[PDB]
Amino acid sequence: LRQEAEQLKNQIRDARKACADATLSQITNNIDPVGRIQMRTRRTLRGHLAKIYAMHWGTDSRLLVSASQDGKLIIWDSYTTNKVHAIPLRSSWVMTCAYAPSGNYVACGGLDNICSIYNLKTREGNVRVSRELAGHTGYLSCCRFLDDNQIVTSSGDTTCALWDIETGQQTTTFTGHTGDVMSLSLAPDTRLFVSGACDASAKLWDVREGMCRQTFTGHESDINAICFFPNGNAFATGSDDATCRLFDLRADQELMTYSHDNIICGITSVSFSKSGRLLLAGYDDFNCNVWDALKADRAGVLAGHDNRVSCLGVTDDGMAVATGSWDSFLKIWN
Amino acid sequence: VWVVGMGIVMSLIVLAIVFGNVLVITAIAKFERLQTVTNYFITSLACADLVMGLAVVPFGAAHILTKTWTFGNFWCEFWTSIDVLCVTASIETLCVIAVDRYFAITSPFKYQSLLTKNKARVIILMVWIVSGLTSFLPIQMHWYRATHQEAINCYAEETCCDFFTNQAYAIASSIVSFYVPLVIMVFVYSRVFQEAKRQLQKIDKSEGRHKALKTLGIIMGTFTLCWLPFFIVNIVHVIQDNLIRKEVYILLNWIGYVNSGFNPLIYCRSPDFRIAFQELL
Amino acid sequence: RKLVEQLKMEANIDRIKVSKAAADLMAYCEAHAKEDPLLTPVPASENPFR
Amino acid sequence: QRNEEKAQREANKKIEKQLQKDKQVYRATHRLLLLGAGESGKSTIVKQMRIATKVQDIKNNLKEAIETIVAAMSNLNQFRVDYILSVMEFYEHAKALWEDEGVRACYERSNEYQLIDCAQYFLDKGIFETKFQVDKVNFHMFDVGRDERRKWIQCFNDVTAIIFVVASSSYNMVIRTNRLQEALNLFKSIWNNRWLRTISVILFLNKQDLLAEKVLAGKSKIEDYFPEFARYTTPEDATPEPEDPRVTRAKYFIRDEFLRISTASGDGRHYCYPHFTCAVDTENIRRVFNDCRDIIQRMHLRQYELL
Ligand SMILES: CN[C@@H]1CCc2c(ccc(O)c2O)[C@H]1O
């Protein structure tokens, strides 16, 4: 019965231990440190009603989109501080947002167990629902756009799924995870993606196969975010406890642990830099830290908000990083 | 030698008032979180206190120490006008803060809709404009100046100038500055304390297992002990000119001035203001 | 049952040495280090924000 | 190129003009989160506050209750039970069911299996948002429910108060901890939450008439399930109605059991508003308004250092 599963898990752990040859810090001890990094708010973006959870930089690096409980998802032009579109939300709650690579559609998901996709670019400048996605038992944790037609969603029913908007049905469903999934990230190659959940386990799924190829369970508490290394062969997660970890997909185990004695709060969002050197992680202690990926040290402190930060995003151009907090003050930091 | 100590004390008081007002204004302006509808009144109060402490307190100290007003008569006119304007603005700002607290406490649901940033700016502009109309307008037009022969010479003389006013202007100016606001805030804080006592009684009854009195007592007693003696002697000297002496008038005027210095301590004890203060320094 | 099948499927997968993965990661980071406005100070004129 | 800048400025102006009214509307209304437990009767309170195909839904609920009774019998007319067990005409078959003595005992022995109370009485014979206005004040209530993790609770940091609906008559139930003590634990978890640092609770104790009905009968002893009640005595202060002293003592013990953790854990900005709500009491709408007014007033007293 369960004895075979326990033996297989022990064998997997032994294989992961045997795969370990040298620690990442031992290899990176020779490299020069990044040094002190000072960042300041080049542009502050205000005018939003309530606390926000979500943000997704556009591929053009110009348009930025955020969502709050106010019942409105509003697109912000980063350069000129102009609210290009203000889309009211049918459901008062949104726990995620997404921006299409083409930029034609904008996705929003909330606690109403239904994800909605808005047609941002229309004739006569009217924003309307294109399709509303079918029920996933529970709040839609996170939503991303593989293309203009397909959206991969996560929700509280412990299941992730990729949907075709034209049909409006579940093309494939990823099941088999114990806890509620809370975050996900898609690889730059878009063939693979991982999902961060509340069951203290982060596992990679294959889009075409529909089966979890690998499973990582290094963390002890529930994890709240996950982002890919720009190379696409590694990804890092932020957890409820102060620790954040970086996992190597080929090494199948946890490479480096990011933690400090002083920090005891939770981590809300994790985003990599364009080069991947700086792992930008938000915190529940009302600030965020720009931590070095390799040396595993604090490159610099970064505090601008009264409330806890709730979302981060590094633009594809890499020019600067934006952060969103519960004070409704979404500030873009370079 | 007694003059040197008094001058040092006056300089220290002016510096303390200026520093407190500047710190309050900087804390209000720098942090976006501290900026709230009820804190625009605090910003106006801080601006008025800073203006008063920077303008009239050093000039008054110079006048009392030197015993001769070296500047021109028009400059002394402007000094008296700006002094009375700042005093009225400060007291009326305390009254407006009391009214805001009354609306916040007595009718909790009406407060959110009634008080707005535009509404706060409108009421602050209205109170500053009414202070101007009540204080600055009669000073320049020369209505207030004493009709009796006494001090007409010193009003004509440029060397020295002392406040000698007609009995008509003194009553109305003192009324609008202090007495109407005194009644308003007394009634407001009586109602607020009654609501606090009712809430304490209800929470004691429900749980089954005062602090507001001390705070209200501070907020009332500081203002009363600072200002009421000066305005009562303002009322009484025009009635009986032989009743008081000039030194008493000056001492009570400066003890009234000191309220602006004390006030940042009284009205900026909120945790957000403490956080802003420790962040700035 | 299903967990047994999933763990059996994920049990037999090839593993690369951790040293090789670390070397590849640091090589990528060093190679693409120059083209990163966060890592090196952004030129004032080239910076769109200011 | 300045035309694009002018167009963007005009669009921003229009968006801000709409957003001003949106913010006014948002600040006008108050948010209440209803954390009513399963089978706690939160539907009755919502219906009371608010105040065919629905008949088909009620018939389906009655069929589900009959299936639950059959399962309870398994956990312990024969063809009719098989039809219904097989079901998993029919009306007549259902009427044949519950006629036997065993099914009547299973209805009496509800401790083993959870059954719908509203359907059971008639049997013998998805987020929900509600907008209700009281005294020209915009109240707008929500229902979030069933996850053990309860991650959505941390989302509700802007609501004025959390209505925690629980049935005091649920002490007799047994599941693997009775639902009353499970609700006590859930209330403690809500109270001892880091994110809910400025949130009050307005709880209602439904089924108080049914609570009296259970208390009058000696079938289940309070001390058998809650030993501390035996040493517990009625507090000196009381709010007697017309009720026997034993019922009042039991109700006050339940209220104190809820109130103990709430009073001990937090002081200031964390207050509890116990209301004894009857099944058919229609004054609960006014009680919620009074409690919300008191909560906002006490928050303002806690601010300004008055306390
Ligand atoms: C001598 N200094 C002035 C004289 C008159 C005066 C003061 C303050 C408030 C008023 O309403 C006044 O009318 C004093 O500060």
Rounded-to-integer distance, Cα A87 and Cα A219, Å? 38
Tokens of B14: 């002016």
**Which run of H or E residues covers position B267?**
helix B246-267
Taking alpha carbons only, the member of D75, D276, D61, D271 closest to residue D169 is D276
Q: Which residue has the tokens 């494939």?
A: A172
Read out DSSP for A7-39? HHHHHHHHHHHHH--S-HHHHHTTSPP------
Tokens of D296: 């906002």
3-state secondary structure of B17: helix
Counting from 1 in the atom list of ligand 1, the atom nearest the Cα of B177 is: 11
Cβ-nearest to A27 among C2, C22, C28: C22
Crossing angle of helices D284-302/B73-106, nearest 10°? Answer: 150
Read out DSSP for B165-185? B-HHHHHHHHIIIIIHHHHHH
Taking alpha carbons only, the member of B102, B266, B91 closest to residue B187 is B102
Q: Taking CB atoms and an 8 Å cutoff, what residues of chain B touch A306?
A: 32-33
| CATH code of the domain covering residue B32 | 1.20.1070.10
Rounded-to-integer distance, Cα B266 and Cα B268, Å? 6
Query: Within its chain, how far is the Cα of D183 from the centroid?
Result: 10
Contact A198 D158 (CB under 8 A): no
* B and A in touch (3+ CB pairs within 8 angstroms): yes
Contact A182 D19 (CB under 8 A): no
Crossing angle of helices D284-302/B180-207, nearest 10°? Answer: 120
Q: Dihedral of CA D52/D58/D60/D66: which sign? A: negative
Chain breaks in chain D (C to N over 2.5 A) after: 51, 76, 88, 125, 145, 176, 242
Q: Are strands D275-276 and D200-206 parallel, antiparallel or unpaired?
A: parallel
Rounded-to-integer distance, Cα D195 and Cα D213, Å? 39
Rounded-to-integer distance, Cα A43 and Cα A41, Å? 5
Taking alpha carbons only, the member of B237, B273, B277 closest to residue B253 is B237
CA distances from B218 to A257, B42, B215, B277, D307 (A): 54, 17, 5, 22, 15
CA distances from B181 to B40, B97, B168, B224, B261 (A): 19, 11, 20, 11, 20
Bridge partners for D133 per DSSP: D138
Read out DSSP for chain D? -HHHHHHHHHHHHHHHHHHHHHHHHHHHSEEEEE-PPTTS-HHHHHHHHH--HHHHHHHHHHHHHHHHHHHHHHH--HHHHHHHHHH--HHHHHHHTT-SHHHHHHHH-TTSS---HHHHHHHH---EEEEEEETTEEEEEEE----SS-GGGGG-SS-SEEEEEEEGGGGG------HHHHHHHHHHHHHT-SS-TT-EEEEEEE-HHHHHHHHHSSSS-HHHH-THHHH----SS-------HHHHHHHHHHHHHHHHHHHHH--SS--B--EE--SS--THHHHHHHHHHHHHHHHHHHGGGT-
**Which run of H or E residues covers position A193?**
strand A192-197
Rounded-to-integer distance, Cα A245 and Cα A259, Å? 8
* Measured distance between the N- and C-terminal CA atoms of chain C, rounded to whole angstroms: 59
Rounded-to-integer distance, Cα A193 and Cα A210, Å? 11
Q: How many domains does chain D have?
A: 1
Sheet holding A63-68, edge to edge: A52-57, A63-68, A72-77, A82-88
Rounded-to-integer distance, Cα A234 and Cα C12, Å? 20
Q: Taking CB atoms and an 8 Å cutoff, what residues of chain D touch B101?
A: 304
Tokens of B211: 């602090």
Rounded-to-integer distance, Cα D304 and Cα D118, Å? 48
Read out DSSP for A130-152? EEEPPP-SS-EEEEEESSSSEEE
Rounded-to-integer distance, Cα A55 and Cα B89, Å? 46
Rounded-to-integer distance, Cα D22 and Cα D14, Å? 12
User: Is D38 annotated among the ligand-binding residues?
Assistant: yes
Bridge partners for A129 per DSSP: A118
Instruction: Determine the distance in angstroms separating the CA of B117 from the nearest CA of chain D, rounded to an integer.
Output: 12
Taking alpha carbons only, the member of D191, D194, D24, C7 closest to residue B112 is D24
Is-contact A250 A233, C-beta < 8 A? yes
3-state secondary structure of A81: coil
Q: Which residue has the tokens 């990163």?
A: C36
Contacts of residue B236, defined as CB under 8 A and 6 or more positions apart, other chains included, come to: B243, B244
Is-contact A239 A247, C-beta < 8 A? no
Which residue type, as a one-letter code, is found at position D129? E
Chain breaks in chain C (C to N over 2.5 A) after: none
The domain ranges of chain C are 1-49
Is-contact D111 D174, C-beta < 8 A? yes
Is-contact A279 A292, C-beta < 8 A? yes
Tokens of D126: 């998805």
Beta strands in A25-159 (DSSP E): 41-45, 52-57, 63-68, 72-77, 82-88, 96-99, 105-109, 115-119, 129-132, 140-145, 150-155
Range of the domain at B225: 2-280
Is-contact A108 A97, C-beta < 8 A? yes
| CATH code of the domain covering residue D142 | 3.40.50.300
CA distances from A40 to A37, A261, C38, C44, C50 (A): 10, 25, 12, 14, 12
Rounded-to-integer distance, Cα B262 and Cα A96, Å? 49
Q: Dihedral of CA D231/D235/D241/D245: which sign? A: positive
Q: Are strands D200-206 and D161-167 parallel, antiparallel or unpaired?
A: parallel
CA distances from A37 to A244, B242, D307 (A): 20, 73, 44
**Which run of H or E residues covers position A314?**
strand A309-314
Rounded-to-integer distance, Cα B244 and Cα B237, Å? 7
Interior/surface letters B28-60, b for 16+ CB within 10 angstroms, e for the rest: beebeebeebbbbbbbbbbbbbbbbbbbbbebb
Read out DSSP for A267-287? ---EEE-SSSSEEEEE-SSS-
Q: Which stretches within B31-144 are classed as H helix?
A: 37-66, 73-106, 108-114, 117-141
Query: Which B residues, 14 through 33, put their C-beta within 8 Å of a C-beta on chain A?
Result: 32-33
Rounded-to-integer distance, Cα B23 and Cα B28, Å? 9
- Write out the residues of chain A at the interface with chain B, using a CB-CB cutoff of 8 A: 46, 306, 327, 329
**Which run of H or E residues covers position A288?**
strand A288-292
Taking alpha carbons only, the member of D106, D45, D6, D57 closest to residue D287 is D45
Tokens of D200: 């009050």
Is-contact B47 B74, C-beta < 8 A? no
User: Would you call D138 exposed, middle or buried from its count of C-beta atoms within 10 A (0-12, 13-18, 19+)?
Assistant: middle
CATH superfamily of C1-49: Transducin (heterotrimeric G protein), gamma chain (4.10.260.10)
Taking alpha carbons only, the member of C13, C15, C8, C14 closest to residue A7 is C8
CA distances from A81 to A109, A246, B23, C38, D9 (A): 25, 35, 31, 22, 9
Taking alpha carbons only, the member of D25, D49, D14, D5 closest to residue D292 is D49
A110 Rama class: left (phi>0) / alpha (psi -120 to 50) / beta: beta
Residue of chain B minimizing CA distance to A328: B33
Counting from 1 in the atom list of ligand 1, the atom nearest the Cα of B165 is: 5
Taking alpha carbons only, the member of A326, A325, A328, A320 closest to residue A57 is A320
Residues present in chain A in total: 334
User: Would you call B8 exposed, middle or buried from its count of C-beta atoms within 10 A (0-12, 13-18, 19+)?
Assistant: exposed
**Which run of H or E residues covers position A185?**
strand A181-186
Tokens of B216: 């209200």
* Measured distance between the N- and C-terminal CA atoms of chain B, rounded to whole angstroms: 37
Q: How many CA atoms lie within 13 A of A186 on its CB side?
A: 24
Rounded-to-integer distance, Cα A278 and Cα B187, Å? 60
Q: Taking CB atoms and an 8 Å cutoff, what residues of chain A touch C10?
A: 12, 212-215
User: Would you call C33 exposed, middle or buried from its count of C-beta atoms within 10 A (0-12, 13-18, 19+)?
Assistant: middle
Taking alpha carbons only, the member of D20, D109, D28 closest to residue D71 is D109
Residue A147's CB is within 10 A of a number of other CB atoms, namely 11
Residue B220's CB is within 10 A of a number of other CB atoms, namely 17
What phi and psi values does residue B207 have, to the nearest 5 degrees?
-70, -50
Q: How many CA atoms lie within 13 A of A225 on its CB side?
A: 29
CA distances from C36 to A59, A275, A278, D65 (A): 16, 6, 10, 64
Chain A to chain B Cβ contacts (< 8 Å): 6
Is-contact A49 A92, C-beta < 8 A? no
3-state secondary structure of B61: helix
Sheet holding A202-206, edge to edge: A181-186, A192-197, A202-206, A212-216
Q: Which stretches within A22-174 are classed as H helix?
A: 24-28
Q: How many domains does chain B have?
A: 1
Q: Taking CB atoms and an 8 Å cutoff, what residues of chain A touch D35?
A: none
Is-contact A28 C26, C-beta < 8 A? yes
Chain breaks in chain B (C to N over 2.5 A) after: 209
Tokens of B188: 């407001």
Taking alpha carbons only, the member of C33, D151, B2, D204 closest to residue A230 is C33
Taking alpha carbons only, the member of D143, D214, D154, D165 closest to residue D44 is D165
Contacts of residue D150, defined as CB under 8 A and 6 or more positions apart, other chains included, come to: D189
Tokens of A159: 């299941």
Instruction: Determine the distance in angstroms separating the CA of A301 from the nearest CA of chain B, rounded to an integer.
Output: 15
Taking alpha carbons only, the member of D119, D80, D118, D86 closest to residue D102 is D80
**Which run of H or E residues covers position A171?**
strand A169-174
Bridge partners for D137 per DSSP: D134
Contact A49 D22 (CB under 8 A): yes
Query: Within its chain, how far is the Cα of D13 from the centroid?
Result: 45
Is-contact A311 A304, C-beta < 8 A? no
Residue A314's CB is within 10 A of a number of other CB atoms, namely 22
Instruction: Determine the distance in angstroms separating the CA of A206 from the nearest CA of chain D, rounded to an integer.
Output: 27
Bridge partners for A72 per DSSP: A88
Range of the domain at D229: 1-307
Residue of chain A minimizing CA distance to D5: A80
Is-contact A219 A200, C-beta < 8 A? yes
Query: Within its chain, how far is the Cα of A196 from the centroid?
Result: 8
User: Would you call D53 exposed, middle or buried from its count of C-beta atoms within 10 A (0-12, 13-18, 19+)?
Assistant: exposed
* Measured distance between the N- and C-terminal CA atoms of chain D, rounded to whole angstroms: 58
Taking alpha carbons only, the member of D180, D242, D183 closest to residue D211 is D180
Taking alpha carbons only, the member of D171, D294, D274 closest to residue D227 is D171
Tokens of D16: 């801000």
Contact D22 A72 (CB under 8 A): yes
Which residue type, as a one-letter code, is found at position B258? V
Taking alpha carbons only, the member of D51, D35, D234 closest to residue D128 is D35
Tokens of A258: 């990011």
What phi and psi values does residue B258 have, to the nearest 5 degrees?
-60, -20
What phi and psi values does residue A139 have, to the nearest 5 degrees?
-65, 135
Is-contact A82 A117, C-beta < 8 A? no
Is-contact A211 A221, C-beta < 8 A? no
Cβ-nearest to B108 among D259, D293, D304: D293
Q: How many CA atoms lie within 13 A of B233 on its CB side?
A: 18
Tokens of B279: 């962040």
Contacts of residue D92, defined as CB under 8 A and 6 or more positions apart, other chains included, come to: none
Contacts of residue B12, defined as CB under 8 A and 6 or more positions apart, other chains included, come to: none
Contacts of residue D47, defined as CB under 8 A and 6 or more positions apart, other chains included, come to: none
